Ligand binder design. Structure first.
Ligand SMILES: *[C][C]([O])[C]O[C][C][C][N]C(=O)C1=[C]C(C2=C3[C]=[C]C(=O)[C]C3=OC3=C2[C]=[C]C(=O)[C]3)=C(C([O])=O)[C]=[C]1
Ligand SMILES: *[C][C]([O])[C]O[C][C][C][N]C(=O)C1=[C]C(C2=C3[C]=[C]C(=O)[C]C3=OC3=C2[C]=[C]C(=O)[C]3)=C(C([O])=O)[C]=[C]1
Ligand SMILES: *[C][C]([O])[C]O[C][C][C][N]C(=O)C1=[C]C(C2=C3[C]=[C]C(=O)[C]C3=OC3=C2[C]=[C]C(=O)[C]3)=C(C([O])=O)[C]=[C]1
Ligand SMILES: *[C][C]([O])[C]O[C][C][C][N]C(=O)C1=[C]C(C2=C3[C]=[C]C(=O)[C]C3=OC3=C2[C]=[C]C(=O)[C]3)=C(C([O])=O)[C]=[C]1
Lengths: 462, 462, 28, 428, 454
RNA sequence: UCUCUCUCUCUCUCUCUC
RNA sequence: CUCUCUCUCUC
RNA sequence: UCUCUCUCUCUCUCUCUC
RNA sequence: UCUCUCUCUCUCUCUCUC
């Protein structure tokens, strides 16, 4: 049981080491200095170069249908250099085959797609913490208020099962609803070989959505949605109902700390063997890495570097939809809602005035650290029954409804509504779990927060 | 998501280009000079010619029942020419079939009703900014003080859904009340084939009014009004109640900047391809068009050209019922209320002394520009619920009433009254939204106004 | 008589003013 | 009481205005179809006129006829067999009428108001006539119910257009059969109970279950029907308990309203006599239907080799909805013995097209009763408890203790006449 | 009634829409295979076209063929014998068509919808033809059932794809054979009734037991089937019990739906003639099929030394699913004597590959009946309470023994001994004339053999 | 604009252990 | 429940 | 000669470039 | 080799000339 855990840690560390040494090689090939190599924007550009080089289907499409005034075999992006204290942007072009060769040499001749998926999740978390997706929500017919379920909405299809665990209930519902809308518009959807392929995709997406849900009624309803040969308006409405139900009876969304490649590259250049030490995306390793890492960023004139650092921290730990109170408790500084952040996105546009732009250090440090969870809370585990030890008269208790429900009407909407009506926004989940100090590597002594003072806000996008 | 937006912009630009090139053709056929072609009165006459040519039902009625001393196949209007610095009016008559042919040739052989609806909305906005409709309000039994809801009261029926989005809650309530009054007077209303048609019209109008409202109680009350087989005095009183409630819990009225055809014609003659660049009725395009456009108007003796220019500006941007403070902030010059404007309507009557009339340039320029909204404010969106990231004890918060209200006494008047009683005329809506400088094409950096100095007036009609 | 309330046209922060006593006196 | 006197007087006037509309409209249609005094009083003519109005106001079926027209029949015209006697003999000619013209005549007779009460009143009269004449075991066997519960099929032929009023007069068997059809449709079609239309069906299923629950009397029956309603996806199990509930109704009978809906010919004759139902008032459960029938003369077409007395008894039972009532009590009220259905030498009142309208003679219907009684909306007095209750029940418990039958001269129902009592089953 | 008229009208339109699709599809296929009027009206050609459609929509079999392709036959193409008349002589050429092409043609004919009702209708037509032509005693004996219960073999050739619609038309004997085969596989394979698949088999076993139970009429028979369903591990006890149930169905006949499913050539000719089934509607148990066959002319291939009338009677029998019906009643309706199968001087309608397609001549089929009757879904063969109406002191009587009474094998045997082969069933119901489209005046017959397969 | 007392004289079903 | 309801329908 | 109350780590691979 | 926090865009078509 321990051996499997140590191999898992070694494999994750291998992925991290590959990403870091690729970043070091890219910094060497780009002639970036230490400061320029630690800039988050340069790392964003380099990661996007990697992702676009290995986007096989898009590359093939670009070869078949060339873009306007662009070579389909070259990637690029903005690389920022400091000359005499002034920042300037450059568009430098790299062959896709060269990028692929460098990445494979970084991973010891292997095209490790796990690191690519890691960078993809990092970008998705950053986009989730920065930009809202209300327009896409409204277009598909879902309420703009279920933004908390839209984690991982920018993750592309090539992420696969690794990225599927990260995307929330809202994004899966949105994709299924898009499929149903396409089927409603054109009946030739779900017909032909493409029809068989899209039916398989629909079944697989419904199955992973079902795995996301926790209560039996939600699983039964998504099962009923999956069983329809030609899903129409009814299944789209049922999906919307399930998405709204996910606000109270939450789902199992996997949260991982995917740091920018600059941190990994600095760690690998420092001499940290992730293969020997081991890495975990849900434990203390990202926190320990972020505490002793220095990252720089570009601050547009009249912006608050503290707000940008908070945004990057939230993106790194995928805490965009987290309660502001617990996020502030872990960070030690107030996590300000999105409305009151005097900052724009991390990425710099091509039309910006690259003469008033400044540079600031990012405060990616937290007082406490906590375990990142897949669970969405308790829906209402333990000991169901008693095993008698003493020969005493006594009633022998057991949880009869829970035992029987595994051994047994067809309208589960009423049951779901009843379950959500029973719930109150005051129940305590994750009982007995707390936040650990940075020195508590083994997570032995937890600290439970007491939020029973004057009330701060709780929703980042509120 | 971006592709649909660019096609929408292209379609709107196609409509604008058609209107402009029609204006150019009409100016060529009328032998108007540049100054006379830029006169707002001549453009009003030409637009009215277009609208009367394509008013199919009125044309058919005129053919069946001829007017007194008028040819039912000819449109016309006052065309003003300058001879030796003196303005003179002329009544010139054009065949309706000729006007239709010219308009269709302008839109590439298509009878584009979208441009006609655009001109209709421009005229409606001008009439809203110029003339008050208190007599019609009093006749239908509604308070003369709900003039702020009477946007688009002069829009004819042929506008359809495009014009229905522009007309406010007051006009829809007034039309429904007229229908109810007709039903009350004559019981043969709502009977026969005409009865079925008018029942369908009543249902459709109630449905679009329901779409206008925001709070659930208002929607439920208009639903209850719609469900009556023979609506009588009770439904008329409930409609009046809803109209009064719309003063505090405002509705969703769509505001668009519909400029006079002279501006579009000058832009098309200049060489601006609206098809390639794209046009938006809620963005910077009308502001950018108005800044570099010169329009002339006829000033009667003893009038203030600044007041007439302000009136035309308000009409162009549909800011008639806007707060005077924000309108003045956007314009940069004080928007004077209607009572203190020393000016009459734009149109010149046939009995006026066309020898003392003068000409003035219209100052249709604004310092700032802002996005035109459909929303009527907040009624009291965002993030409803938390998705846990860290395994910490914590209460998991959610907005229970908001989630539950979508999953659920019959007298909603008390609830509406309670909702309006909670509201105060000091709440801030449209939070985090500001006015953008004319150079800020992409609407990146907003400017928030601080109206916290000595108080000016706020109501145009006050 | 006059205009009791504002109907917003521009998406700007602003307080939305209305004559609360006049509107409420018809509801008491 | 002493406060419900005003309420009772108000209800009487409203019912009288409905009957006045029915009578006024019949008078106009008789004058507008050019029917003589004899032909106007024919029950066959009255049914045809009544059926014309009911179809003229059938918005849904009229809409479907417009969209999908029938063969040789335009969907804007209605009519039926009108029997005219000239030169001693009877002949039948189909009358075609615009449904809108019929609607205007009906509305004008009701002072321009729709008066949906009158249409439902005629619908109940037709159901009462069908219940006394025809026995629908085919629908009972087709839906899976035992054909022996023919006493619970009261108002099974009523269209769904008769809401509230129609549901009050219909019986447990009809309510169960309606639910069973819903269950059968849901089992066959998986999309049933789902989607926007499923929600509409669910509210209909709930509402019709609620009226069935209110129809029952014992607390056990109400609870079980409550359980059947709660089923989100009812299936075979809900099939069975509804069948069991129907079988329990034979012993623990429900509360089914019984109203005396007379043919429109009787109302037309009364209104022509100057009777003001609005002023004097009316009631479908009191003496007014009995006193109207005593002074009313109506004729019917008699097929050859048919007893006029048996046909008159059939109309008398349909008038007072005594199809499923005890023959002894029905015989005692009428004064002449009421014969069971199997011993009736008559066919239905309505005459078919394929029937030679040349050997048919007319007879006067004897719709007069020696006594008069008040119509009742009540019966008499989980699952193992239900079976226990009907085991204690015996077919000798006296019901309606102290409540009897009055004389036609006793208009206030002051002195009851308790009967003392060989068959008792009409359909047996 | 008066509310079921609307529902009756709805059903007529839906069936008429199905009939329209079959005709529209047949017309399209005839013009695509380049068939003349004579060849378009050939029953053999219609059979090939219908079978091509059914195979094109066989999702399960097509998948198996793809995984395990046959030798020389790609699993993406279907076809059959198409017979063309050139220079007066008949020739057969095997046509190969892409299943995707046939599926698209069928869907286009039905306005882009799958319309599996039309496919099940054609499958029922093939089943009726098989029942009237071929007798499957070998399957009866192989399952252990007595070969004498051939009257209950209705729809034994129907594939499992025909659910509900197919199950309604299939008989007690075929249903019992399905149950027995399930039992035999369970006895032979211990894994059966166990595991994930055993759960699926159990639900399938339950469903077909319920539909078999609804096929019976006597309460004793239904209770006997209900017991067999409860058996968690069925064995020989249910094997024998079901065999008794089938033997009982010979006397206490079940409810088997009978529908007149005509060949697609008849529908194609009707649709090409401008006839609109969707507008005037249709019915498989009413006069509509009888009226269609009166005006419809259909040709067939007649093998040398074969009576054309006997083949026409065989097709007439299959059209109305009267294979197991009384010969006297069938003879009365047709107007010409119906002969038993043993005295039919003809082989099956479908022509074999090995047959010399040079001595074959074509003849017109006499699918005309003197009378027309309503097909029945029923087999062979009072008030007990009161509802008070008046407020009187009487006692509400009820039949206590009968009401509380409803709260095996000897009873069933007793029921059949009372029954005799003389009881009059369907009392007062007769046969109408083709000119009587409204079923107004029945014509009750007065009635040497009565067994087709005797 | 139909018809009928008393076992289906018309009320389909939107395909398969896929 | 010896009268005290009804303005119609998955329209 | 080790550590721990209370599954969430890991391979899952992509209908289409979107 | 792109950009963006926060639905306001667009087709909806008209009881009657009013
Ligand atoms: C178990 C499992 O596997 C099952 O699954 C199911 C689903 C899948 N499928 C799909 O996707 C498809 C199919 C198809 C088909 C069809 C459809 C429908 C019907 O009805 C019929 C059919 O048929 C067929 C098919 C295929 C193939 C063949 O062969 C036959 C499709 C089409 O068709 O196109 C598509 C898809
Ligand atoms: C549901 C949906 O789908 C549809 O809806 C529609 C609505 C509107 N309209 C209506 O409704 C109407 C109706 C009518 C009628 C009537 C009325 C009332 C009563 O009560 C009765 C009736 O009837 C009838 C009708 C029509 C037709 C026929 O046939 C019959 C009207 C009149 O009448 O006019 C109108 C409208
Ligand atoms: C298999 C089951 O049983 C489970 O397992 C696990 C748990 C228990 N344990 C056991 O069994 C074992 C252990 C071990 C170990 C040890 C021992 C001893 C000492 O001292 C130390 C130790 O350490 C360790 C272990 C394991 C693991 C880890 O990690 C550590 C063993 C050995 O070692 O051999 C065996 C068994
Ligand atoms: C479908 C969903 O996912 C949504 O989508 C949109 C958003 C995201 N994106 C994506 O996916 C894409 C994009 C693109 C693009 C690009 C790329 C690259 C570069 O470098 C540049 C660019 O640009 C652009 C785009 C789009 C649009 C626009 O406007 C611009 C793509 C291509 O291109 O291919 C793809 C995908």
């Amino acid at each position: 049981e321990r051996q499997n855990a140590t191999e898992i840690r070694a494999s994750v560390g291998k992925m991290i080491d590959g990403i870091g040494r690729f970043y070091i090689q890219m910094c060497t090939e780009l002639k970036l200095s230490d400061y320029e190599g630690r800039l988050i924007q340069n790392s964003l550009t380099i990661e996007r170069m990697v992702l676009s080089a290995f986007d096989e289907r898009r590359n093939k499409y670009l070869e078949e249908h060339p873009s306007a005034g662009k070579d389909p075999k070259k990637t690029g992006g903005p690389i920022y250099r400091r000359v005499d204290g002034k920042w300037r942007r450059e568009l430098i072009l790299y062959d896709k085959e060269e990028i692929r060769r460098i990445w494979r040499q970084a991973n010891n001749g292997d095209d490790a797609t796990a690191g690519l998926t890691h960078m993809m999740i990092w970008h998705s978390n950053l986009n989730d913490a920065t930009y809202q997706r209300t327009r896409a929500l409204v277009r598909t017919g879902m309420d703009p208020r279920m933004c908390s379920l839209m984690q991982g909405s920018t993750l592309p299809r090539r992420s696969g099962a690794a990225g599927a665990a990260v995307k929330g209930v809202g994004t899966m519902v949105m994709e299924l609803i898009r499929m149903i809308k396409r089927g409603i518009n054109d009946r030739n959807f779900w017909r032909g070989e493409n029809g068989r392929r899209t039916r398989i995709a629909y079944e697989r997406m419904c199955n992973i959505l079902k795995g996301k849900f926790q209560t039996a009624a939600q699983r039964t309803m998504v099962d009923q949605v999956r069983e329809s040969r030609n899903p129409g308006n009814a299944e789209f409405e049922d999906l919307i109902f399930l998405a709204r139900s996910a606000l109270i009876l939450r789902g199992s969304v996997a949260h991982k700390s995917c740091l920018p490649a600059c941190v990994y590259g600095s760690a690998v250049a420092s001499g940290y063997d992730f293969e020997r030490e081991g890495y975990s995306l849900v434990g203390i390793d990202p926190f320990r890495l972020l505490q002793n890492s220095q990252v720089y960023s570009l601050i547009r004139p009249n912006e608050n570097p503290a707000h940008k650092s908070q945004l990057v921290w939230m993106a790194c730990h995928s805490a965009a939809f987290e309660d502001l109170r617990v996020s502030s408790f872990i960070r030690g500084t107030k996590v300000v809602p999105r409305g009151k952040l005097s900052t724009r996105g991390v990425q710099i546009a091509s039309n910006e005035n690259m003469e008033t732009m400044e540079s600031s250090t990012l405060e990616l440090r937290s007082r406490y650290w906590a375990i990142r969870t897949r669970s969405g809370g308790n829906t209402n585990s333990g000991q169901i029954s008693i095993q008698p030890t003493f020969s005493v008269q006594r009633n022998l208790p057991f949880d009869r409804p829970t035992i029987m429900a595994a051994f047994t009407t067809s309208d589960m909407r009423t049951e779901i509504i009843r379950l959500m009506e029973s719930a109150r926004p005051e129940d305590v989940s994750f009982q007995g779990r707390g936040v650990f100090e940075l020195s508590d590597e083994k997570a032995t002594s937890p600290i439970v927060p007491s939020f029973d003072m004057s009330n701060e806000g709780s929703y980042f996008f509120g």
